[PDB]
Amino acid sequence: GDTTITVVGNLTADPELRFTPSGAAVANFTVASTPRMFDRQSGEWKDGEALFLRCNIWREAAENVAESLTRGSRVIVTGRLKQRSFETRKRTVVEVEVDEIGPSLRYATAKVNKA
Amino acid sequence: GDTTITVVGNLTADPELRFTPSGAAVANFTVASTPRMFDRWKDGEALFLRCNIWREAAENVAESLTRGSRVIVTGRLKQRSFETREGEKRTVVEVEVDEIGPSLRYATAKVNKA
Amino acid sequence: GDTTITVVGNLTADPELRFTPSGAAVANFTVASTPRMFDRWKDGEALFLRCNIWREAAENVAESLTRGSRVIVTGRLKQRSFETREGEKRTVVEVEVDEIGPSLRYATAKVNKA
Amino acid sequence: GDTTITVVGNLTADPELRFTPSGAAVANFTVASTPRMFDRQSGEWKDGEALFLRCNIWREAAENVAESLTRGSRVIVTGRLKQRSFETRKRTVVEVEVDEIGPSLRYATAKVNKA
């Protein structure tokens, strides 16, 4: 029993594809979820918190991401919340191990190809 | 305090775009979600959820997706209690979609930016 | 790849503890979840989910909760397509519970550690 | 549209109740979600990642938490993911603004009182 979450947002930049020594592909990126707060006084719905989530995806699904998504795409993401330890000069970070992901058809249309 | 859910699965039938005489557009599609563990091992159970999305998105949906497409759907769980004048006691569930996209798990897609 | 949901709401009726002749214990309860925004404004819509939990938890549930209790439920969305030999075409949904607890939003509780 | 999540875990310590200058109560705590990985070789299900989430809850619901929960209780939590900026000597942190919360009846029974 892991802690999963769905994140809707935009990619801060282009997907970053590298390779492990053994050859498996990995893509990393952050998504930016911006909520809209109502403001029951002056103006209608405004822009809320930031929320920058670093997700990393693997092997052949990561290959697909690198080929389909770019800077500032609106995506839907579902994944597991992981926690990593980085060294000072020492605390934690929170990332999203991606299970599924795809371009949101809210403001865009897509041309899909199955493998 | 609405109950929301995320659902991954494949569409069971091409989307059904329709227009309200008020000029608004609507898409209806149902998602079939099916677990699948492996070895000694495969398949297991299923879930069919009637879904609907409104406005622009609905048009993009009907243009981008087809039967069998693996989509990720997020939305709200709506429920109605129909009939009683027949004796019975029926109930149905649907999902008012917020966001939806094709999955890039087994596919690649060219996202025509629009 | 199971579809899970979180649900907040009140129990509609005291839990129904039962024992299987195999010595296992089972709890059945349905949650009613109802949105409620305010001013000019109150109430709106509803959701009834048949729930079931097994084993130890089931015993604790039947001892801790009653009708009207506000619980937080997390679990799995199970669905069955019953009947057809009647002409019709019925479908029902239930929730196989993983975790459940009373909500401390409008209540306090003394958690007898056990 | 915020990013919400459900966290099941245990409180690392006792709830910490303070008060804003105006009088509103606030409770803070971290929950510890430990997943169990199967290990299809030697041993059955093991203990997985850590996952420490700092949740903070407000006014009169926080009062209720401070009165009902203690060190190492198993709780269910549902909330929004917030991101805060702390000063170096400068990056971000991720916390959970709690909506609802309660003791899980998995291994414990509870005696509830309505207000």
Order of strands, main sheet of chain A, comes to 1-3-4-6-5
| CATH homologous superfamily caption of chain A | Nucleic acid-binding proteins
Distance between the termini of chain A: 31 Å
> If you consult CATH, what is the topology of chain A?
OB fold (Dihydrolipoamide Acetyltransferase, E2P)
Organism (chains B, C): Mycolicibacterium smegmatis (strain ATCC 700084 / mc(2)155) (Mycobacterium smegmatis)
Keywords (chains B, C): DNA-binding
GO molecular function (chains B, C): single-stranded DNA binding
Protein name (chains B, C): Single-stranded DNA-binding protein
What does this structure look like?
4 copies of one chain form a homotetramer. Chain A has 115 residues and is mainly β. Chain A has a single domain, classed as Nucleic acid-binding proteins (OB fold (Dihydrolipoamide Acetyltransferase, E2P)), CATH 2.40.50. In chain A, 9% of the residues lie in helices and 48% in strands. Chain A is built from 1 helix and 7 strands, in the order E-E-E-E-H-E-E-E. Chain A has one helix at 59-68; strands at residues 4-11, 16-19, 25-32, 52-58, 74-85, 92-103, 111-114. The first copy, chain A, has a 5-stranded mixed β-barrel. In chain A, strand 2 (16-19) and strand 3 form a beta hairpin. The longest helix of chain A has 10 residues, at 59-68. Chain A is globular and about 55 Å long. Chain A starts with a strand and ends with a strand. Chains in contact: A-B, A-D, B-C, C-D. Chains A and B meet through helix 1, strand 5, strand 6 and strand 7 of A and helix 1, strand 5, strand 6 and strand 7 of B. Strand 7 (111-114) of chain A pairs antiparallel with strand 7 of chain B, so a sheet runs across the interface. Chains A, D: One of its GO terms (cellular component) is nucleoid. Chains A, D: Residues 1-105 form the SSB domain. Chains A, D: It comes from Mycolicibacterium smegmatis (strain ATCC 700084 / mc(2)155) (Mycobacterium smegmatis).
